Amino acid sequence: KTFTVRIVTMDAEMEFNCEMKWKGKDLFDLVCRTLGLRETWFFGLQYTIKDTVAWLKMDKKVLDHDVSKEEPVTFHFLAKFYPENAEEELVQEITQHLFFLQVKKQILDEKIYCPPEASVLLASYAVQAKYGDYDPSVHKRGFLAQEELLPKRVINLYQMTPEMWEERITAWYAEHRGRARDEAEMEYLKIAQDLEMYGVNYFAIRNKKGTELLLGVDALGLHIYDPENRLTPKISFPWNEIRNISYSDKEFTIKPLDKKIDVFKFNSSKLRVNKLILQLCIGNHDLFMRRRKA
Amino acid sequence: KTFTVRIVTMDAEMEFNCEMKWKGKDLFDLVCRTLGLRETWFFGLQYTIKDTVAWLKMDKKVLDHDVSKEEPVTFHFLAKFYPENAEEELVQEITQHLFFLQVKKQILDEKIYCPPEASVLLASYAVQAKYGDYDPSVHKRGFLAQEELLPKRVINLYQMTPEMWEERITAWYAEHRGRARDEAEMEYLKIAQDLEMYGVNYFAIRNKKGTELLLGVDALGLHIYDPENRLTPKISFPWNEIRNISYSDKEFTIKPLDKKIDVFKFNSSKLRVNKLILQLCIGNHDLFMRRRKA
Numbered sequence: 001k002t003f004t005v006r007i008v009t010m011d012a013e014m015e016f017n018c019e020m021k022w023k024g025k026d027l028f029d030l031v032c033r034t035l036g037l038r039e040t041w042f043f044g045l046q047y048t049i050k051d052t053v054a055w056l057k058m059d060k061k062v063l064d065h066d067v068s069k070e071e072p073v074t075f076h077f078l079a080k081f082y083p084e085n086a087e088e089e090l091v092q093e094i095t096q097h098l099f100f101l102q103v104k105k106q107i108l109d110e111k112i113y114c115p116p117e118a119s120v121l122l123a124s125y126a127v128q129a130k131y132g133d134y135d136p137s138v139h140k141r142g143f144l145a146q147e148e149l150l151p152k153r154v155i156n157l158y159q160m161t162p163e164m165w166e167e168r169i170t171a172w173y174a175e176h177r178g179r180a181r182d183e184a185e186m187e188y189l190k191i192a193q194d195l196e197m198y199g200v201n202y203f204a205i206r207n208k209k210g211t212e213l214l215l216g217v218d219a220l221g222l223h224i225y226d227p228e229n230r231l232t233p234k235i236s237f238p239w240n241e242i243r244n245i246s247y248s249d250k251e252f253t254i255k256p257l258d259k260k261i262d263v264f265k266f267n268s269s270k271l272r273v274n275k276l277i278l279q280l281c282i283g284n285h286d287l288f289m290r291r292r293k294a
Numbered sequence: 295k296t297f298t299v300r301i302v303t304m305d306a307e308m309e310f311n312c313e314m315k316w317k318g319k320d321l322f323d324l325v326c327r328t329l330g331l332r333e334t335w336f337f338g339l340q341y342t343i344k345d346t347v348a349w350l351k352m353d354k355k356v357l358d359h360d361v362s363k364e365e366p367v368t369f370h371f372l373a374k375f376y377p378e379n380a381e382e383e384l385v386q387e388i389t390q391h392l393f394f395l396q397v398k399k400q401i402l403d404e405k406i407y408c409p410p411e412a413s414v415l416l417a418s419y420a421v422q423a424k425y426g427d428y429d430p431s432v433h434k435r436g437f438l439a440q441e442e443l444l445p446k447r448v449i450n451l452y453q454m455t456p457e458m459w460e461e462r463i464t465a466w467y468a469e470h471r472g473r474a475r476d477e478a479e480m481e482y483l484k485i486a487q488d489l490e491m492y493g494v495n496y497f498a499i500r501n502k503k504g505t506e507l508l509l510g511v512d513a514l515g516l517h518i519y520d521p522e523n524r525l526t527p528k529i530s531f532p533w534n535e536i537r538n539i540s541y542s543d544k545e546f547t548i549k550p551l552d553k554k555i556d557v558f559k560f561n562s563s564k565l566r567v568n569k570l571i572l573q574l575c576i577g578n579h580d581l582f583m584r585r586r587k588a
Contacts, residue, residue, distance in 0.1 A: 115469045121415075175409045 010101035082199035124172030128184035300366035304395035418466030
């Protein structure tokens, strides 16, 4: 027969009857159809193995994955890949909305570094999206007292009173009058996507000299960071300038298209992490080309 | 022989020896070459007839123009047309720079409406472009005291001292650390180009019911505004939807390509103004078509 699956989006949770033998693709397609989401290339169904993220594979039976067999089998529907320009690439409202909620949560939880003035500008669009137009007759002093709008780190950097933080957000909010909810969420993405950590998946690696570094995998390419600086990578390899990315035991090899550049090798200890790195490299390389033409 | 011509750019003033019989084209080309400017189609050499703007005509002798002959004969080198997409179309540093200075002055002079928070963010990029990275050891409280950074309109909307505005501007300025000066000017333009009044030439007109209205001519088309609202036009005629634009006496006729829409007629009495409207319509329409390979 079927087994119950619970799907958690950034919006809500829902359940479906999964045919005991369906593959990831079947379940994934059903979720996307239900949401009315056709820009499917950015999304996946996430589960966790130990303390590492993993994504359902399209060509593999759902119950063959390393997931609890206990009903309901639960997956989180999330963006696995990010566009380079949200305004250009995200055509549907549902798609824009789900990116907005996912990225906002990353900002509020300090997964993406966001400086204070940017955080206030972002909060003002989140307020527009939720409340609609500012109206001083309805939105009186203190109207935002129970809303989570800013990263905690930002409060630590400024020594302002509750009233002054509210005023700073309101000031920007007042200038968005006339903007529809969906527009506000897109404006939010437009600002967020310029943040240096936006859309980057970081992994601890070691180069051949044994130096601890971070690998960043993103929509633009593969990047090497010093561990103390997640903002600006020291080396970048654009997706269209990489010939091959292979893995064997704890070692990855980045093969440049330009033969004048030597192959770049690094090590990564966890098998489950390496599997994820490969998933993200293949997918990002793919979308990079798709978004460019072809 | 020659006569001295004074050319005023947004950067500085310079003088040239203009041959007694040179045409507009000769003097314009000399100015562009001197600036190292090849993206010349956006620019012209401006003078004033009574209270109205006028542009040097390329095929007419400089001295046959209705310009004061008191040496130095003076022209202002200015953008007459604006790109639809500044980041894409303004490729040379000089072109970007001249656009940046001219639009900034429009903002500071209140020719383009700009709300307060936007004004501060804009100012912060103007500061990055002028001073380079924020350095608190050099840029002490008060370092911006003699700079004109915000529209007077904005300053007068609040009870804030110059030091308080400096604080707001500095907070943003601090977040631009690492941005090159030319890049900061482009960031300024990207924000400015989205302001509702950006790039619009306005003219007082009367429709056939005798109603006072404003004609807006810009890179995208022709627009009809209520005089009390220069931000949002009530009617827009995109350039690719207009057959032709002409006038006879004080009457202009806009002829839609969609025969289902009646021609739009309006009056404008000042001949000097009507000549300017025509030039701006022809040039904008022509550039719009050319951007679209037609």
